Design a protein around this ligand. Structure first.
Ligand SMILES: O=c1[nH]cnc2c1ncn2[C@@H]1O[C@H](COP(=O)(O)O)[C@@H](O)[C@H]1O
Ligand SMILES: O=c1[nH]cnc2c1ncn2[C@@H]1O[C@H](COP(=O)(O)O)[C@@H](O)[C@H]1O
Ligand SMILES: O=c1[nH]cnc2c1ncn2[C@@H]1O[C@H](COP(=O)(O)O)[C@@H](O)[C@H]1O
Ligand SMILES: O=c1[nH]cnc2c1ncn2[C@@H]1O[C@H](COP(=O)(O)O)[C@@H](O)[C@H]1O
Lengths: 202, 206, 202, 202
């Protein structure tokens, strides 16, 4: 039931997207913030100092580089987006970044997850204490992955026609309604005219 | 799927009640004139006498398929066997050695985008990996069971009750034993086995 | 004369060490903090929010993993230290981490610098918009490198017999006295009985 | 005076190029062969079996991928070219390939050298038992590097207006005339209308 941090990526009849949701037990005092071409997970007012207690709770969860949208549960969002910006195919950008940064060094060896999608293809990846996996996202269906339990891509009928709807869906919609401890969500959606961002709170 | 019993190159890795091992088998349709050769701490896949020039026709048919570096055994379907073994020798955990090598070398640029597969195992752990046109995967080998993977069809680790108590038996098994008997076009096989007193090598022919 | 962030690594008659110094014009309100097996560069009281303005000003500058000391001007200190901890020679740990993380995406394409040293060898590295370099530290002499100007290893007669002295030296000693805008420094020293840490302020 | 394998890269008033020269003491029975978009170093008739004695003597020394020319002293020519073809900037393609493949495991720890150049930029690299280096080629001057002695980029007034002239020059021209044991050379030249290849023998 508790999947921790979750991300979804893919395309539906309305367009392409990436969605992100923070689920948390020990660090629930966080929200999402939209800035230029990116969405950051940051502490809510009055909890700024939490970033000094744990180095894995504040980071950009979404980055937009040209026609590409990158989503992840950590600072590797920037590592991956930067490589894409400097010229590197999606598979290698995710693969190299995850191989180098590796799983998080906390009490649970929390995995680093990520995905990236452009106009022609998409990839999803994860690195844990047991391995590294980067795979092409099925053209026929959107998928999601999480840091706990669902540490493997899983198909999902992700319905959404805007970033607002995408963020809401991963937060409280469909099968995601059953995953516990929701805190905040964000998403990027491209209906063909460019990437738009949005966030949703409980 | 089912009607496609040709798996191409196959490797197996794991431990059983007799010890730890890596096994390799060459299955081939277009390059069946090859054999395995044992050299110092390694086993190479090479053309049989009279076909030496094939290496100049295709750069992926001759290579070391097994390398032993200290307590570690490395197995793969290409020259990345050396890339990985070298990193292990210079100090690099198994997962990263395989991951970095496969990420860099990538799938083979032939008519089928033939994947590069590999595995490595030491006294405490083992990892298996593959890189294809659709991705990269390196995973810890289950302590409870040996696994195998191939370049075609079985491009994902699969459990196997690998019975063997020596490198000779391991090579024979992946060549004609158990479920491997059903995989077509066998050519030659090799294996490394460690019963606790060190890695020993062997090859088997049809 | 402004070298930005500086690091030194090597051995002298007293032992082996790594030293780090923060020089800064736009973010001078920072100090160094010692925690378990590491030293972090963090904002001084009342400036915590600066970490949300620039993602490159707060990070562990020194990490100790067993017999190895790692020093760097960014979060790649952890990326490198983690690889060393999981088994990876110094050259590759630095090489892989810098190749993946790359130079910083600010107004100056600020390079990422790093060094690591154990009982038998040491390496130093840098990645800029013009390249990547990782090299063995000369056994005969300590060296230093910075993010601006001295973007290449340079020999230095680094005198010090403790982490306190090492931190002081890179802050105000020898040729470092001429490098401007000093803010805070830290160092790790091993006289043969283990790595000890220290920080020094102006 | 013996530099082993040598490569040059850069641009002059006539165009851009990469040049390669095999110098050898123990394996002089080799020549260069032009194939589709590539030049291979192979044994001369009657010495085919040498490839089974040493794994580092036969390989593609030049690969052309679209607007990019790649040159190297080993099979990493393909590793690098393939990454460029699949989308990867020149610096990272060379950096990743050299980091992974490393120096050659022979009696001399022979380095792996490489360079790549397209319409807007060029990079040169080397990996030895002492390190890894990938750097931007100066826009103002061509440079060369070798496996022995000149294991660092060096400026060269490389005169040539065609691949034939480029191959000849690195083989017997200018300062290269002084480097001993020449065997065979090859080059790729782009005067603006595409990459053309050529080889030259003593
Ligand atoms: O948003 C996040 N991304 C990545 N790791 C996180 C995040 N939030 C928490 N963690 C890590 O996961 C552990 C578990 O957090 P929890 O499951 O929410 O209680 C923490 O101690 C952190 O180290
Ligand atoms: O032993 C091998 N290892 C890796 N690739 C191979 C090997 N043998 C053949 N190949 C590649 O796989 C393609 C198919 O070989 P085949 O399946 O035997 O017909 C060839 O064109 C080669 O590029
Ligand atoms: O300690 C540091 N490590 C890495 N980058 C830094 C650090 N301090 C500042 N920077 C970056 O360098 C730029 C210039 O900083 P300044 O030279 O101190 O004014 C900043 O805008 C940051 O992006
Ligand atoms: O063309 C080449 N590229 C890379 N290494 C080579 C080449 N030729 C020879 N070598 C390596 O360099 C060593 C010395 O070659 P030599 O200097 O020509 O005698 C050999 O044993 C090989 O391992």
């Amino acid at each position: 039931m508790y999947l921790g941090r979750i991300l979804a990526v893919g395309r539906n009849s309305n367009g392409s997207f990436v969605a992100y949701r923070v689920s948390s037990r020990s660090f629930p005092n966080r929200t999402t913030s939209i800035q230029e071409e990116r969405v950051a997970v940051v502490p809510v007012e009055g909890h700024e100092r939490d970033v000094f207690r744990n180095p894995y709770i504040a980071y950009n969860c979404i980055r937009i580089v040209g026609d590409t949208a990158v989503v992840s549960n950590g600072s590797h969002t920037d590592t991956i987006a930067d490589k894409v910006a400097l010229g590197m195919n999606l598979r290698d950008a995710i693969g190299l970044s995850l191989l180098a940064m590796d799983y998080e060094k906390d009490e649970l060896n929390t995995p680093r997850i990520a995905a990236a999608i452009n106009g022609s293809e998409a990839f999803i990846g994860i690195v844990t204490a047991d391995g590294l996996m980067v795979s092409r996202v099925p053209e026929e269906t959107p998928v999601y992955i999480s840091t706990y339990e669902q540490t493997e891509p899983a198909a999902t009928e992700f319905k959404a026609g805007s970033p607002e709807e995408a963020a809401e869906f991963i937060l409280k919609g469909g099968e995601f309604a059953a995953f516990t401890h929701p805190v905040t969500a964000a998403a990027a959606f491209n209906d063909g005219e460019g990437w738009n961002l949005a966030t949703r709170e409980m």
